Design an enzyme around this catalytic site. Structure first.
Site, PDB file in Angstrom:
ATOM      1  N   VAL A  26       0.732  -1.249   0.140  1.00 27.76           N
ATOM      2  CA  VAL A  26       0.013   0.049   0.068  1.00 27.76           C
ATOM      3  C   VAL A  26       0.952   1.243  -0.036  1.00 27.76           C
ATOM      4  CG1 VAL A  26      -1.447   1.585   1.657  1.00 27.76           C
ATOM      5  CG2 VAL A  26      -2.397  -0.671   0.940  1.00 27.76           C
ATOM      6  N   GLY A  27       2.046   1.277   0.835  1.00 31.79           N
ATOM      7  CA  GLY A  27       2.708   2.585   1.053  1.00 31.79           C
ATOM      8  C   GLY A  27       3.854   2.325   1.936  1.00 31.79           C
ATOM      9  N   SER A  28       4.742   3.362   1.971  1.00 28.03           N
ATOM     10  CA  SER A  28       6.000   3.312   2.671  1.00 28.03           C
ATOM     11  C   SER A  28       6.380   4.585   3.041  1.00 28.03           C
ATOM     12  CB  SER A  28       7.116   2.541   1.672  1.00 28.03           C
ATOM     13  OG  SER A  28       8.395   3.115   2.139  1.00 28.03           O
ATOM     14  N   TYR A  29       9.545   5.353   8.201  1.00 27.68           N
ATOM     15  CA  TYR A  29       9.272   4.691   9.437  1.00 27.68           C
ATOM     16  C   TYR A  29       9.104   3.005   9.160  1.00 27.68           C
ATOM     17  N   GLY A  30       8.363   2.639   7.893  1.00 22.76           N
ATOM     18  CA  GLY A  30       8.205   1.410   7.853  1.00 22.76           C
ATOM     19  C   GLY A  30       7.408   1.192   6.213  1.00 22.76           C
ATOM     20  N   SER A  31       7.110  -0.071   5.895  1.00 23.36           N
ATOM     21  CA  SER A  31       6.292  -0.645   4.877  1.00 23.36           C
ATOM     22  C   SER A  31       5.241  -1.044   5.370  1.00 23.36           C
ATOM     23  CB  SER A  31       7.016  -1.465   4.002  1.00 23.36           C
ATOM     24  OG  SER A  31       8.292  -1.057   3.453  1.00 23.36           O
ATOM     25  N   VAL A  32       3.964  -0.678   4.571  1.00 16.43           N
ATOM     26  CA  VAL A  32       2.714  -1.069   4.939  1.00 16.43           C
ATOM     27  C   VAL A  32       2.047  -1.917   3.836  1.00 16.43           C
ATOM     28  CG1 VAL A  32       0.329  -0.243   5.367  1.00 16.43           C
ATOM     29  CG2 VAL A  32       2.328   0.880   6.359  1.00 16.43           C
ATOM     30  N   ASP A 162      -2.051   8.727  14.074  1.00 14.22           N
ATOM     31  CA  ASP A 162      -0.795   9.213  13.636  1.00 14.22           C
ATOM     32  C   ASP A 162      -0.469  10.233  14.755  1.00 14.22           C
ATOM     33  OD1 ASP A 162      -0.389   7.558  11.402  1.00 14.22           O
ATOM     34  OD2 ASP A 162      -0.514   9.255   9.947  1.00 14.22           O
TER      35      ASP A 162
HETATM   36 MG   LIG Z   1      -0.830  10.849   8.774  1.00 17.23          MG
END
Ligand SMILES: [Mg+2]
Ligand SMILES: Nc1ccc(-c2ccccc2C(=O)O)cc1
Ligand SMILES: [Cl-]
Ligand SMILES: [Cl-]
Ligand SMILES: [Cl-]
Ligand SMILES: [Cl-]
Length: 345
Positions: A26-28, A29-32, A162
């Site tokens: 989905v996206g990338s 602090y880390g990968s998701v 967040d």
């Molecule tokens: Mg945010």
């Protein structure tokens, strides 16, 4: 211990329990990744932390984030569904994965692409304040409230996400939405700040829902300050005494004095109770801003306020923030919090 399986997705090796299926980047602090959780029936977001223990600062930030997410248990705040590591001992422990409910639309999409009644604004701001009353009762400051950090579903129900977990200098420079919602005393480091910075952000967001436009879209820190002072007026002697920097005080006194403006002539056509609440949030002296608990009792929310259904949080021990430890000690503390996690009902 669950059974784990491995797979490579976009040049990254993910090792997760069998309950998580159909992983999709989905996206990338880390990968998701997005995934389906067969245990709960929910679509979830799975975040693999990037280099969680690379330095002392990173190890402590990893611990901070896990402690915070484990504590938050409220309808209007993001909570932790699961946390896991494939390691079988502390000696081989290196990777941390966090699992939360998969969020869809944020407030940005709604504000930009939808016509909002006054009843919509009431319900959305009510839920932000209800979550903030919970967060502030634990002596936690969110620090980064803005439309992209607020998830909204089809029934107009809202969740805060967040948390500010300690932003670069480049991220806050120029014509950027990451600065437009920040209280002036934290944007220019006037003084030690506290939880009242979050109420300033709620005021900026509420104004944007009412007009459809950003309230203070400054092109840099100083342009933004000028926009703020034109609306709320220049500081008086009382607040100047509270500004710690002598050079910041000097700069402020170089500006020609300006009265506070009439908010009914700024927010033309808005509910008069909404105007009244905005004047109590958007106060320059942070000591005098309305609090979250006080705002929930304001007449603007009479349709939704229920003092028996606005809960506070269990106490939250943050003594670790003043502790000086080595990487492996922060890492061992994190390991203990992973293995002691107990899922929600
Ligand atoms: Mg945010
Ligand atoms: N009472 C309540 C509060 C928030 C949500 C919600 C909001 C945004 C995204 C997801 C959710 C959700 O948990 O389904 C739902 C119900
Ligand atoms: Cl590992
Ligand atoms: Cl935003
Ligand atoms: Cl003057
Ligand atoms: Cl605690």
């Amino acid at each position: 211990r669950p059974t784990f399986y491995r797979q490579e997705l976009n040049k990254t090796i993910w090792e997760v329990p069998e309950r998580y299926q159909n992983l999709s980047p989905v996206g990338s602090y880390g990968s998701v990744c997005a995934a389906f959780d067969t245990k709960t029936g929910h679509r979830v977001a799975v975040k693999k932390l990037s280099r969680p223990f690379q330095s002392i600062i990173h190890a402590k930030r990893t611990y901070r984030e896990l402690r915070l997410l484990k504590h938050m248990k409220h309808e209007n705040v993001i909570g932790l569904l699961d946390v896991f590591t494939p390691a079988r001992s502390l000696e081989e422990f290196n990777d941390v994965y966090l699992v939360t409910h998969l969020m869809g639309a944020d407030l940005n999409n709604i504000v930009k692409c939808q016509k909002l009644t006054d009843d919509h604004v009431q319900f959305l701001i009510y839920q932000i304040l209800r979550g903030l009353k919970y967060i502030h009762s634990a002596d936690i400051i969110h620090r980064d409230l803005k439309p992209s950090n607020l998830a909204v579903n089809e029934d107009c129900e809202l969740k805060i996400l967040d948390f500010g977990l300690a932003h670069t200098d480049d991220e806050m420079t120029g014509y950027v939405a990451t600065r437009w919602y920040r209280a002036p005393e934290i944007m220019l480091n006037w003084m030690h700040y506290n939880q009242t910075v979050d109420i300033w952000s709620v005021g900026c967001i509420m104004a944007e829902l009412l007009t459809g436009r950003t309230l203070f879209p400054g092109t840099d820190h100083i342009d933004q300050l000028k926009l703020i002072l034109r609306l709320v007026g220049t500081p008086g002697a009382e607040l100047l005494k509270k500004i710690s920097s002598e050079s910041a005080r000097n700069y402020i006194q170089s500006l020609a004095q300006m009265p506070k403006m009439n908010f009914a002539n700024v927010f033309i056509g808005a509910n008069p109770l909404a105007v009244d609440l905005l004047e109590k949030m958007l106060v320059l002296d942070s000591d005098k801003r309305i609090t979250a608990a006080q705002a929930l009792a304001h007449a603007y929310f009479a349709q939704y306020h229920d003092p028996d259904d606005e809960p506070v949080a269990d106490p939250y021990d943050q003594s670790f923030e003043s502790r000086d430890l080595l990487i492996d000690e922060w890492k061992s503390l994190t390991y203990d919090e992973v293995i002691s996690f107990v899922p929600p009902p």
